[PDB]
C-alpha cells in the first residue's frame, strides 16, 4: 500500500515515592523519531533531532506556554494522579496459584512441574520453588511477567524435576494482595 | 520510580485515523472514541469514580492532524519504516476440558498502528464474544495491542489468531489447540 506518516504526542508523568517527586516529560514523535521534548527538570523545550529545532525555538519564545508547562507537574500530573489513585495505585487482585506437571509421565523420568500464577495485580510478584523444604533456585524456566491487557498479569514458572516417590514440591508466591505468602504443593 | 501516567495520542496518514488514551503503568485507563465522541473506560468500574470531557481529545487530534501535515513536509515526505509485529497466543488461565477460558492474542512491537486481526476456529472466522483494545504505546514508540477470544476448551477444535500488517510478507497465523 502507500507510504504512511505518523505523528505521536506523549505526556508522561513520572511519580517517585508517591508524589514527593514528580517529573513531567512531554514528547513529540515523528514516525519513530522523537524530535522535541519538554522536561519539567530542564524547564524549557529541547530539540532532540534537527527536525525539532524550529519547534523548540518557537515554543520557548511563548511565555504563557512556558509558564503553563512549568506548573503542569502540579496542575496536571499531581492532579490526575489523585483523580484515579483509588483504583490504580490502590488496585489489588490476589493471584490464582495452580500447580501441575506438563506431561503425564511415570516417576523418576524427567518432568516439568508448572506453577501457574494468574489474574493478579499489581505486577510486582515473587514465585519460588521448594523441594522438601529446601529452596530450588536452579532449573527454573519462567515466562517472566506477562501483561494480559486488562489490568491483570500472569506468569508461568516451571521447575525441572525428576520426581522420586515421596518428594514434596512447593510453589510459594508473594504478592502485595496477600498478607502471608501463598503456597501450594504437589506430591510425587 | 513507582508509577507512570501517560497521555498518548497520534494521527496517521493517509489513513486519517487518530487515537487519544490515558495509560497507567502499561494499562489503559480510557480512550476516546473518535466517532461516538465519548470517552470509553477500559474497566467500567473506572467510569464510576472519574470522568473525562471527550471534546477535549477531539481538539488535540485536530491540532495533531495539522501538525502531522507540517512534519511530513518539513521531513521532505520521508515515510515511516514498517516494523512487523511479534504475535503470541496465550490462554488466560490453565485450561480444563469444558471450562470456559479466554484466548489472548498479544500483538507487540510494531508500527505503524494499523493491523487487521482475525480469529479462526477450524479455519473459519469467529466473532462471538471477541473484544480488542486500542493501540497501547511503548517506550520505543512502537505499539502493543490485544485481542480476545472467549472459548470452551475441547480436543476437537483448533484456533488461529490471523494477523495482517504491512511489515509482514503475508498474513501471520498463530496456532493454538488443546494438548492431551
Amino acid at each position: 500500500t502507500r507510504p504512511r506518516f505518523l505523528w505521536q504526542l506523549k505526556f508522561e508523568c513520572h511519580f517517585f515515592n508517591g508524589t514527593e517527586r514528580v517529573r513531567l516529560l512531554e514528547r513529540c514523535i515523528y514516525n519513530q523519531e522523537e524530535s522535541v521534548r519538554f522536561d519539567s527538570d530542564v524547564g524549557e523545550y529541547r530539540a532532540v533531532t534537527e527536525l525539532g529545532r524550529p519547534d523548540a525555538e518557537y515554543w520557548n519564545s511563548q511565555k504563557d506556554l512556558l509558564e503553563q508547562r512549568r506548573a503542569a507537574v502540579d496542575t496536571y500530573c499531581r492532579h490526575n494522579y489523585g483523580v484515579g489513585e483509588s483504583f490504580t495505585v490502590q488496585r489489588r487482585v490476589e493471584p490464582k496459584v495452580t500447580v501441575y506437571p506438563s506431561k503425564t509421565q511415570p516417576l523418576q523420568h524427567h518432568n516439568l512441574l508448572v506453577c501457574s500464577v494468574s489474574g493478579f495485580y499489581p505486577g510486582s510478584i515473587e514465585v519460588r520453588w521448594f523441594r522438601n523444604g529446601q529452596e530450588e533456585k536452579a532449573g527454573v524456566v519462567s515466562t517472566g511477567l506477562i501483561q494480559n491487557g486488562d489490568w491483570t498479569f500472569q506468569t508461568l514458572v516451571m521447575l525441572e524435576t525428576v520426581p522420586r516417590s515421596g518428594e514434596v514440591y512447593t510453589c510459594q508466591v508473594e504478592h502485595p494482595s496477600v498478607t502471608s505468602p501463598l503456597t501450594v504443593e504437589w506430591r510425587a | 520510580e513507582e508509577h507512570v501516567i501517560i497521555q498518548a495520542e497520534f494521527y496517521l496518514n493517509p489513513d486519517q485515523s487518530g487515537e487519544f488514551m490515558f495509560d497507567f503503568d502499561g494499562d489503559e485507563i480510557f480512550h476516546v472514541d473518535m466517532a461516538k465522541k465519548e470517552t470509553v473506560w477500559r474497566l467500567e468500574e473506572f467510569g464510576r469514580f472519574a470522568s473525562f470531557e471527550a471534546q477535549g481529545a477531539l481538539a488535540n487530534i485536530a491540532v495533531d492532524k495539522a501538525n502531522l501535515e507540517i512534519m511530513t513536509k518539513r521531513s521532505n515526505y520521508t515515510p515511516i519504516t514498517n516494523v512487523p509485529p511479534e504475535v503470541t497466543v496465550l490462554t488466560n488461565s490453565p485450561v480444563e476440558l469444558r471450562e470456559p477460558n479466554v484466548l489472548i492474542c498479544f500483538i507487540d512491537k510494531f508500527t505503524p498502528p494499523v493491523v487487521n486481526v482475525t480469529w479462526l476456529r477450524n479455519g473459519k472466522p469467529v466473532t462471538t464474544g471477541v473484544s480488542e483494545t486500542v493501540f497501547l504505546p511503548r517506550e520505543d514508540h512502537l505499539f502493543r495491542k490485544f485481542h480476545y477470544l472467549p472459548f470452551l476448551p475441547s480436543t476437537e477444535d483448533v484456533y488461529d489468531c490471523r494477523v495482517e500488517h504491512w511489515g509482514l510478507d503475508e498474513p501471520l497465523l498463530k496456532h493454538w489447540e488443546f494438548d492431551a
Partner: peptide
Amino acid sequence: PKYVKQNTLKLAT
C-alpha cells in the same frame, strides 16, 4: 474527580 488533559501545541510554520 475529572481527568485533566494537556493541550497539544501547534508546530512552527
